[PDB]
Write a protein that binds this DNA or RNA. Structure first.
Ligand SMILES: [Zn+2]
Lengths: 178, 101, 64, 70
RNA sequence: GAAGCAGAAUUCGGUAAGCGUUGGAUUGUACCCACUAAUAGGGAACGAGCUGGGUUUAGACCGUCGUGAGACAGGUUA
RNA sequence: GGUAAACGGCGGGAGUAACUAUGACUCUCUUAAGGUUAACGAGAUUCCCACUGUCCCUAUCUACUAUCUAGCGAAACCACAGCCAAGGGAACGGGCUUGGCAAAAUCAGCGGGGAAAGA
RNA sequence: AGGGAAGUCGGCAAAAUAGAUCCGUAACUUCGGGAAAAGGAUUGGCUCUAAGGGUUGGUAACAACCAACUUAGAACUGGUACGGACAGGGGGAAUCUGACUGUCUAAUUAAAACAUAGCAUUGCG
RNA sequence: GAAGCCAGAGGAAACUCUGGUGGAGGCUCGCAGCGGUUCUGACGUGCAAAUCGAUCGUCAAAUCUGAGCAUGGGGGCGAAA
């Protein structure tokens, strides 16, 4: 029945099933439930923002597109002031997700990067490796990199999203400061 | 057509007589006995649609009205107009009478 | 429970099991020769549904 | 109600909850683990035999099919 | 013939095969029900009549075993 | 080294111990799956209504046979033959022994025996 | 005749239904079906009525001429029977099973067998 | 009775409903044809070294069929017995 357990144990169990479950629908339902409780009350977080981020950041490169969308919803739900101090590890996860082979997870990782930029722009552009490594990743997955053979240059909606996220990243990095 | 013509004349397939139908038409008591003979739940339309002239139960008013425009119904009407054959008519045919003193 | 029967067979208002079976027979077309409802066949259908779990039922646990 | 029945039966004997379906089973892993434990207990014998008993139409052959996967 | 066998209904035993000893339900595989006076037991088969199981040529499927051809603890269909 | 929509198989880790392989012994985790089966079928099974000679329980009619006649006309099979009872150690008897008995020539059926199954 | 599966391993066989018009048609469902679901009312003959057209000709919305088959309605009438012979679905509740249409053991097995679409894997520039 | 098409009633449109038209489908009943499900079927030294009757499956296609040609036995061919 799972009714004698308290809301904290429900939170921890559903987080554990969201991380370790072998069913895409089960992971989607667990992520939706924890997102619903975080939306209803931010104080209903027994494991904290750091623990939530540490558990759900490997789920960026998940093959399930619905799970990725619900993870983005959780990220947008998650409080920005608590997101701000941990920008570096998240940026490592966006770099891995952009470098991942699949174009769908590349696009959803760009969406996560857009969320990170609109939530905490300064920490992203100021943390160690947040500028040049991100620019290297952008150049690599745009194909914009600077023995007798020549190489051919390396869809449309994906490239448009890539250029838009790059433009927003450059605008955030060179935003006029007062 | 007639269902199962091979056994139409069997006693277990017998239908109601014209004299019985005439007595039902004249007297509601005799029709009441004939209706209490049958269990009303096992009748078409719960026995609310009945043709006395044809002695038949029907499923609906539409079925009853469709029956009323058919030649079996008109044959039954003409037979009732001519009159059923009875014991008194038999005695009248043979010229025999009851003497009650 | 009665509401489970009403939701399952989309019928209501019976006073007893005989009328319930008769209404179900007339609705589902289980009619014999002469317009007589097939209460036996309808009862067999309902029993088969009851054992095959198309009709929800359970025995409540005893209270401690 | 199912959890209450499991409590009442686990007062007496070790009990498991089960939905015997080939496509969508429940409790299959727990039943496999219990049979593995009994095999560990009877490891001295070459194999163990688990016989299924009950009323007709309770789901014995369906439980066998769910455990087998076929 | 005997028995607390009053009568009724019987029980046990004896002579006796003259005369009868039925109709049905159940195959997820020999006992129930009723009528009847009663529904006794066997042999002539069991030391080339017909028809259902044991039962098993060739087709096919599942289960166990085998590297395999295949076999079987088996189960099903024609 | 890799590979299980290859055949297959159905747990893991730690402690102990330290050539090689084994095992034993404890301790501890012990889970993929809970809140479309239609249509079609000389496929297999159970039941209900109707229905009727399936049965109670058999009766009657028609045609073609079977039957008789004119003509025509085989085959299978065949040691010899064909009534039983008891005995005939090799649980066999149609011939032997001992009895019952036993009368020409035939016709239609019949399936006990003999015979008869590319047996 | 009466009974209606009491027969039989087993409704084997036979009987029962059947064409057309109209009323009406449930669960389930891949929404396409199921479905002729189921369950009911009628059908002969005769005498009529009504509707559905073509050609030619200056409100032609009219005249003349010509033509054949359907459809609907009404009265009368015979009756034991009216798809009068012939022709022609019995139906329903479920279970297992193979997706379906199709194919094979000529001469004992037509089937859960084979094939099929769909799915997946392998080798090869 | 599938697409496509016509008209009417709505709906701002998209579309919704109704009445038609149309004639698709390895759809269906069914004649020929093709095949061979069932019958204590007929027949059993038969009309027949596989036939006959009723019944049954399919019938616009993975349907039926002729002639010419190709594949020849430690081979072929096989919707596979
Ligand atoms: Zn009338």
């Amino acid at each position: 029945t799972t009714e004698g357990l308290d809301s904290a144990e429900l939170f921890k169990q559903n987080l554990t099933l969201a991380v370790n479950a072998k069913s895409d629908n089960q992971r989607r339902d667990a992520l939706a439930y924890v997102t619903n409780q975080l939306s209803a009350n931010p104080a209903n977080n027994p494991v904290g923002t750091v623990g939530v981020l540490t558990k759900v950041l490997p789920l960026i490169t998940d093959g399930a597109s619905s799970v990725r969308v619900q993870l983005l919803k959780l990220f947008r739900t998650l409080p920005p002031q608590e997101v701000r101090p941990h920008a570096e590890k998240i940026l490592l996860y966006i770099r891995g997700g952009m470098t991942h082979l699949s174009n769908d997870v590349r696009t959803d990782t760009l969406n996560v990067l857009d969320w990170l930029l609109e939530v905490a722009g300064d920490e992203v552009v100021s943390c160690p490796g947040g500028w040049l490594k991100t620019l290297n990743s952008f150049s690599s997955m745009l194909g914009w990199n600077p023995k007798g053979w020549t190489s051919a240059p390396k869809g449309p909606e994906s490239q448009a999203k890539q250029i838009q996220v790059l433009a927003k990243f450059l605008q955030t990095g060179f935003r006029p400061e007062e | 057509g007639v269902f199962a013509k091979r056994t139409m004349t069997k006693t277990r397939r017998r239908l109601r007589d014209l004299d019985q139908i005439e007595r039902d038409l004249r007297s509601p008591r005799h029709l009441q006995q004939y209706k209490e003979t049958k269990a009303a739940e096992d009748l078409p339309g719960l026995g609310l649609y009945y043709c006395i002239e044809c002695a038949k139960w029907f499923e609906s008013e539409t079925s009853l009205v469709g029956h009323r425009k058919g030649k079996p119904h008109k044959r039954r009407l003409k037979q009732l107009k001519e009159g059923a054959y009875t014991h008194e008519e038999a005695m009248a045919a043979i010229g025999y009478r009851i003497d009650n003193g | 429970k009665q509401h489970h029967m009403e939701r399952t067979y989309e019928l209501r208002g019976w006073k007893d099991h005989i009328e319930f079976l008769e209404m179900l027979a007339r609705k589902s077309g289980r009619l014999l020769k002469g317009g007589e409802p097939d209460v036996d066949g309808v009862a067999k259908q309902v029993l088969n549904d009851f054992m095959r779990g198309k009709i929800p039922w359970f025995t409540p646990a005893p209270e401690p | 109600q199912a959890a209450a029945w499991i409590r009442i039966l686990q007062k007496d004997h070790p009990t498991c909850a089960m939905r015997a379906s080939i496509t969508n089973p429940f409790g299959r892993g727990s039943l496999i683990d219990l049979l593995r434990q009994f095999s560990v207990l009877h490891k001295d014998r070459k194999q163990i035999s688990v016989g299924l008993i009950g009323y007709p139409n309770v789901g014995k052959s369906s439980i066998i099919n769910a455990l087998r996967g076929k």
